[PDB]
């Protein structure tokens, strides 16, 4: 990805995380589990959601009857009508096509960026209180129980 996280330094996805797009997975002496980061996931939803609508909402179309009907002595204007149809039907094809290829790249980058920001959000809080194991994981130098694991999630981790 553009932001190096997805299929990057965090080479795989969690089939176990089922309640969100980006999240955490902790493992302390008390247990372990997947928990989606709600805030960043919702926001991504809101955004992607709003993106799709735009691509659909912005498509204005008025009542029209494409077909025409020209007699054997109106070939020129008939071919002109053709040129218009083929014409617009070349614009929208190339456009719709690239619009997708491009916005797709964008969407994926967006997700990557979101994962990286989350990773770095945590990376910031922990600081020297955990070693980075270049795979999206942090191993605390101290014991971190569920309240602790919670604090890092809801972004309120203590003195690092």
């Amino acid at each position: 990805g553009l932001f190096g996280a997805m299929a990057g330094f965090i080479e795989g996805g969690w089939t176990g995380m089922i309640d969100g797009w980006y999240g955490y997975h902790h493992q302390n002496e008390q247990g372990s589990g997947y928990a989606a980061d709600q805030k960043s996931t919702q926001n991504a939803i809101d955004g992607i959601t709003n993106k799709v609508n735009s691509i659909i909402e912005k498509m204005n179309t008025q009542f029209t009857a494409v077909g025409k009907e020209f007699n054997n002595l109106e070939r020129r204007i008939e071919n002109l009508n053709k040129k218009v149809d083929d014409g617009f039907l070349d614009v929208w094809t190339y456009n719709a096509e690239l619009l997708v290829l491009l916005e797709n790249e964008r969407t994926l980058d967006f997700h990557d960026s979101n994962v990286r920001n989350l990773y770095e959000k945590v990376k910031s809080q922990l600081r020297n209180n955990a070693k980075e194991i270049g795979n999206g994981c942090f191993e605390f130098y101290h014991k971190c129980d569920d309240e602790c694991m919670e604090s890092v999630k809801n972004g309120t981790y203590d003195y690092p």
Partner: protein, 324 residues
């Protein structure tokens, strides 16, 4: 104790294409392309279409003896022709500005067929009972269009006629009529006497005059003679005046109508049902939500832009990378 930040993954196999990569399997996608259709000709904006079936537009309007079922036609949002719409101008000739008429009658709010010039006592001292042909046969019997009247000749004299109609219908009135062109000058007299006849139509917005263009020409479905069909939309309060010394296939019935905007003529053998739609195509109604469609270039209504694409899938989720 460790905490790892990661991303979702599932059993999805949807694949999208990106500027840099093809077929990237992603967790959640959305389709922006419509390629389905109920394979039914539906109502367009709550108004059913007009089926012609065996008959075509010319046949319907002129009154071809095979379109007797369309004599009650009313409403309609767009017209439907079939791969069987071959029943039209049973009597050879040119339908002047036909395409133009087809287009202008695409959509109609109200449509009422009335006797503008009644057969009985309208053309007295004129033969209005011989105007039949074998080209327009009704159940073996020789007949003729039901909305036009073939004025022949009474005995051995065909006097100069002249009838007028003032549109007091409170809406446009479609007046249809024809001029007949015999294959010779021998037939031109045995029917209209005056081998120098003429026909003239006058409206405040019309004036073209006619003369029989008798000439030697092949025979079509029987006749060597030809009948050119003409029409005109008579505005409210205006008065159309006809007069002729012969060769006039006088209007018998005319339609009082109210045109709204303008749709078109879908031609398809697809079934017709009480379904509704905002976009209609030859193969069936399409959904008008997605920004693009590849069901058919020729559509009527508020439709999705037609594209040669086969796949326009948009990613919504992220790269799908499962495995454990």
């Amino acid at each position: 104790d460790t905490i790892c930040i990661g991303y979702h993954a599932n059993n999805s196999t949807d694949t999208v294409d990106t500027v840099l990569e093809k077929n990237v399997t992603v967790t959640h996608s959305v389709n922006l392309l419509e390629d389905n259709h109920n394979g039914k000709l539906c109502k367009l904006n709550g108004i059913a279409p007009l089926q012609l079936g065996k008959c075509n537009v010319a046949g319907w309007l002129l009154g071809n003896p095979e379109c007797d079922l369309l004599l009650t036609a009313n409403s309609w949002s767009y017209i439907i022709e079939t791969s069987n719409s071959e029943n039209g101008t049973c009597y050879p000739g040119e339908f002047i500005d036909y395409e133009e008429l087809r287009e202008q009658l695409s959509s109609v709010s109200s449509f009422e067929r009335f006797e503008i010039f009644p057969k009985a006592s309208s053309w007295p001292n004129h033969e209005t009972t011989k105007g039949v042909t074998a080209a327009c046969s009704y159940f073996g019997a020789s007949s003729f269009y039901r909305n036009l009247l073939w004025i022949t000749k009474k005995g051995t004299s065909y006097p100069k006629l002249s009838k007028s109609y003032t549109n007091n219908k409170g809406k446009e009135v479609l007046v249809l009529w024809g001029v007949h062109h015999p294959p010779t000058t021998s037939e031109q007299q045995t029917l209209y006497q005056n081998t120098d006849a003429y026909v003239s139509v006058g409206s405040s917005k019309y004036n073209r005059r006619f003369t029989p263009e008798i000439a030697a020409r092949p025979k079509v479905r029987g006749q060597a003679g030809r009948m050119n069909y003409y029409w005109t939309l008579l505005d409210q309060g205006d008065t159309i005046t006809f007069e002729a010394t012969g060769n006039l296939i006088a209007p018998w019935y005319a339609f009082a109508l109210n045109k709204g905007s303008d749709s078109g003529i879908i031609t398809s053998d697809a079934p017709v049902h009480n379904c509704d739609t905002k976009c209609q195509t030859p193969h069936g109604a399409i959904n008008s939500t997605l920004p693009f469609q590849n069901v058919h270039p020729i559509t009527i209504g508020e439709c999705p832009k037609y594209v040669k694409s086969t796949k326009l899938r948009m990613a919504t989720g992220l790269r799908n990378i499962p495995s454990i």
